[PDB]
Design a protein around this ligand. Structure first.
Ligand SMILES: COC(=O)[C@H]1[C@H]2C[C@@H]3c4[nH]c5cc(OC)ccc5c4CCN3C[C@H]2C[C@@H](OC(=O)c2cc(OC)c(OC)c(OC)c2)[C@@H]1OC
Ligand SMILES: NCCc1c[nH]cn1
Lengths: 382, 384
């Protein structure tokens, strides 16, 4: 049946993004709880590397998944992803040491890569009508956005209420439901390593990566800054990230509707500028109510950048080279993985050497400087 | 009495910038009865006003603000009467230079007087905004006045009317300010070269100078590109830059109101970014109607930057140094005059060398890259 595959891909992507969003409120609070005041400055570098682990492992593992799907079909690598995410979910709840969380994040990265590639390939293979295929991708990405929306308040809110191991056991039980649903189941062109050889696609990917880095580096160091300065309760740390998702969804909807009238490159330029301004204004708030504005602006900005830059990548891939159903997926996935691997990993050294606001100033200046480079993309030729 | 001091600066900036923009309709049509020689006349006011400014700033410390303002009145009246009668190239140069020196005197003295009378930062954030609004109104209404008077009632009429308005302004100034005695300011202000070692003053001056240079480089090179590219009639050249003036006026009053509430540094940052984006999107239009948007954005953002950076100089000089406001506003007028002088003299050479779109791209990129540096003015450290 054509449907069930849509539901299983939905649940897999939702659970993966939920795990990514839920890991952020809990790990620094877990490190605070074990010792007992901040010993965090020694921790900051240690807390980071752990977050960039999944990005680096997914980047390493992504090229190998290509021919593996061709050799042994699509159903087999999907089953491996569910098992690996189940192992990671079980390991997260029962882990007590820092070393276990590292292997948990690495396993989550491997499972995420396998599940995403296999699920998108299976969704492409099941739908052959040539028109409902786009609707399938739209529903799947909407489910991913819904998982992003739901994940952050989940772990932070239901950590101090029903204990620590609960939000990972719930994810494990949800993953088991995904396995049962998927258990009862049943044109090559221009590879990615040559697609990154033209300046237009490189500028587009760089713009996406530099827009995403502002929220990439916010995860490891924002909760620690909150407990160090603002003196907020432990259940508001994940609640503070709701604007970054709600504004992102509102922006992507409105700007996917509206960006074609006034120009895509203008949308991307304005988006990078507002990312820079929001990241500059983030470390000025002295309470949780001060993070509502800059976070919402940053989410709206990232929505503007993504919704204005994905069609540009698609048009550039179509006009010059040959394109497939998911050529844009690989190019954008390299951007997100590159950002999540470089930003959080290098941010620990910056936070240790110099203060927190200097990292935000650096990110804002980098975004504002890279913003004028989107003029290159207006009317590309060849 | 502090409300009448703002009326004097409003009238002084209204008539002084009236004679600046009234003249560009009438000069190149009279001399025809070669483009470079006509352009150098337009840069005469800015070239000499820059040099007079360093000698005018510290002079306000010793004799007060009334005497320089009366001198600017007398010089502007002499300039307009010299304009109304002379009819040669050599006699249309000294008059422009006199207009420049009078504008320098009036601007520096008026800004210093407004800063001294209005002490509160929040309350000082509106008087300078309304003064810049008066400047915007003068720049807006000068050109059509000169065009219609030259078309209908000869050439001497628009300058004679300006002379009569100048006499009215002088009578008003003698009535309100009493420029008849020399009053020395008690506080000995900091020397001017010491102020240039201040990073925050330099950043504010750089922001004002870059924004005004970006706006000023557009007027002398825009009509040439219009004729070269879209083949427009002559009558739309003046009307193309009208939205810039209107948006500048609306922005200057509205954001003089809103800068204190929303923040000076955020206002300067957003204004410089908007100026950069507008300058970047200017050279893409293919018809007259496509320039309505970018020009309006440029005017709004330039009003943003001017209204934000006017009170910041006084706030810095009050926070870190002694309380005398002549020198830093002389610096701001120097930035304005440098921006207005660099453009008209070299615009044709730059466009013939690299081209109009590259010039617009460079200006927008410079503004965007400098825009991060306004974060430094959020909270300067105070003096010991
Ligand atoms: C985390 O997991 C992700 O990495 C996703 C998000 C990354 C980032 C983010 N992380 C947060 C973590 C938080 O916790 C505290 C709070 C807020 C945020 C935000 C707000 C801002 N934000 C954007 C999120 C978007 C997701 O990507 C897509 O939706 C997408 C869209 C497409 O087009 C429609 C694609 O092409 C078809 C595509 O494939 C290449 C992917 C992206 O990858 C799956
Ligand atoms: N400070 C006013 C600069 C300007 C704007 N428009 C024309 N000139």
């Amino acid at each position: 049946s054509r449907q069930l595959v849509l539901v299983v891909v939905f649940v897999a992507l939702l659970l993966d993004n939920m795990l990514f969003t839920v890991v952020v409120p809990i790990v620094p609070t877990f490190l605070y709880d074990m010792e007992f005041t901040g010993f965090l400055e020694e921790e900051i570098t240690r807390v980071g590397v752990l977050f960039a682990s999944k990005a680096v492992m997914q980047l390493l593992v992504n090229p190998f998944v290509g021919p593996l799907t061709n050799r042994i079909g699509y159903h087999i690598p999907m089953f491996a992803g569910f098992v690996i995410m189940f192992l990671s979910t079980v390991m997260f709840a029962f882990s007590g040491t820092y070393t276990l969380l590292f292997v948990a994040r690495t396993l989550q990265g491997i499972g995420s890569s396998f599940s995403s590639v296999a699920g998108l390939g299976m969704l492409a293979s099941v739908y052959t009508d040539d028109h409902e295929r786009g609707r399938a991708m739209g529903t799947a990405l909407g489910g991913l956005a819904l998982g992003l929306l739901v994940g952050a308040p989940f772990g932070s809110v239901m950590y101090e209420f029903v204990g620590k191991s609960a939000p990972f056991l719930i994810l494990a039980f949800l993953a088991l439901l995904d396995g049962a649903l998927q258990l009862c189941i049943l044109a090559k062109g221009t590879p990615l390593f040559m697609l990154l050889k033209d300046p237009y696609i490189l500028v587009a990917a760089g713009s996406i990566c530099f827009a995403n880095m502002g929220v990439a580096i916010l995860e490891p160091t924002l909760p620690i800054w909150m407990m160090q300065t603002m003196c907020s309760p432990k259940w508001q740390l994940g609640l503070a990230f709701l604007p970054a998702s709600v504004s992102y969804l509102i922006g992507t909807n409105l700007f996917g509707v509206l960006a074609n009238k006034m120009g895509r490159w203008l949308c991307s330029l304005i988006g990078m500028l507002v990312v820079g301004t929001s990241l500059l204004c983030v470390p000025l708030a002295h309470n949780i109510f001060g993070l509502i504005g800059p976070n919402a602006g940053l989410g709206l900005a990232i929505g503007m950048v993504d919704s204005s830059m994905m069609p540009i990548m698609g048009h550039l891939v179509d006009l010059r080279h040959t394109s497939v159903y998911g050529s844009v997926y690989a190019i954008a996935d390299v951007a997100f993985c590159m950002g999540f691997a470089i930003g959080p990993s290098t941010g620990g050294a910056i936070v240790k050497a110099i203060g927190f606001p200097w990292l935000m100033v650096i990110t804002g200046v980098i975004n504002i400087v890279y913003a004028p480079l989107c003029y290159y993309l207006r009317s590309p030729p060849a």
